[PDB]
């Protein structure tokens, strides 16, 4: 009811799944309820890219045009003249939530259909990617296109970052990028004790959707996998980052 | 689950269950953190620590023991007193036949109960409390934590050794292979799993009608399910019934 109380206080629906990999203790709340995944899908996209590309393959330069630019391209629109390596695009996508970077990377792996096939392969039968950015934001209550659950997103993130879906060196690249995320200071990072390391990917969308998925490392112990999702009832509703920070505090306490 | 509560009532036993579908992170729990005497299940965790300290080659090392070293149940070790046995042979005997002397010999090889506990603490297991050798570890009374653990801790520790990076792939398949070929659990978890499902388990039984089984199960299509099913009764000399674990397993499967 600590989570229910937060739902009332922020007038939002909460989706939570946390797993302490050291003890298999979990914290759940509407863990299997669908939410549009928004930008969090960028983390899983790079995971699949790392699966199919050698580290040298990431130095390959990708060329695009102004015509390839979409709604939010903080880094990509600054290099349209020179193109960018896949390594640079993965960096932009994960640390700045660059939409064009996500689109170029998605094309590299075969598009949404291939992304979905690869996730189904690793055991994710829930995440349903269907579109590129920013069209994936066009989700209405009741539909499953471009949605997932807290359990599914957390489990797929764990698969790529902590399990054997990727070899050591590649897991480390993914974790390093996410640890250096620039957009999540007010979310999960704001709800963990000082000294805890966080690797996360945030997201936001229509219906006041505000998400954050992460791997958290206590100073002493095994990592904790956490997915905190949320949405509101109005398409144009505004979100409040504090809901995520507060929900995280409850999770840490519970753990 | 009401289904678990009914089994507890029917068999006059207490159940400790923890199941985790590693592919979906879905779990099935029932008194997951209640302590039970681990009995023979500790043999699987002991071998895990052994593989962690010795190289595959070191496992070839011969071990010499006498009749002095034989205890209350030595189906295998009783046939090699003079020849001796290699660590690999002892591990095999301990895991597949629940050989008690083998367990003790291996326990000594890794440093004794204190060392086993220390290593388990090192991998994240803060509840499993090994203190004695076989068969003394069976001397446990309600309220005491000596030689007890929980379904959650036992399942998690098994997963760490068999499915996680606690052991190199090479040693992990050695452990899984022995357990897959266990000869003592046909009427337990194995009896409650659907046809086509592969099982790697280690059974156990003890005082107060304690009857346990910890396993890694592989469905035809899918990632493994780690499962720990523990049980006990209120009377020290209480008799256990394997059907309880088989039935409890069927519920876990339906749930998953």
UniProtKB/Swiss-Prot annotation, chain A:
Active-site residues, Swiss-Prot/TrEMBL: 39 (acyl-ester intermediate), 135 (proton acceptor)
Single GO biological process annotation from the record: response to antibiotic
Entry's Gene Ontology molecular function annotations: beta-lactamase activity
Top-level EC class: hydrolase
Reaction(s) this enzyme catalyzes, per UniProt: a beta-lactam + H2O = a substituted beta-amino acid
Keywords associated with the record: Antibiotic resistance, Cell membrane, Hydrolase, Lipoprotein, Membrane, Palmitate, Signal
Induction data: By the bacillus licheniformis protein BlaR1.
Residues where substrate binds: 201-203
Membrane topology of the entry: Lipid-anchor
Name of protein: Beta-lactamase
Record organism: Bacillus licheniformis
Gene for this chain: penP
Range covered out of full length: 48 to 302 of 307
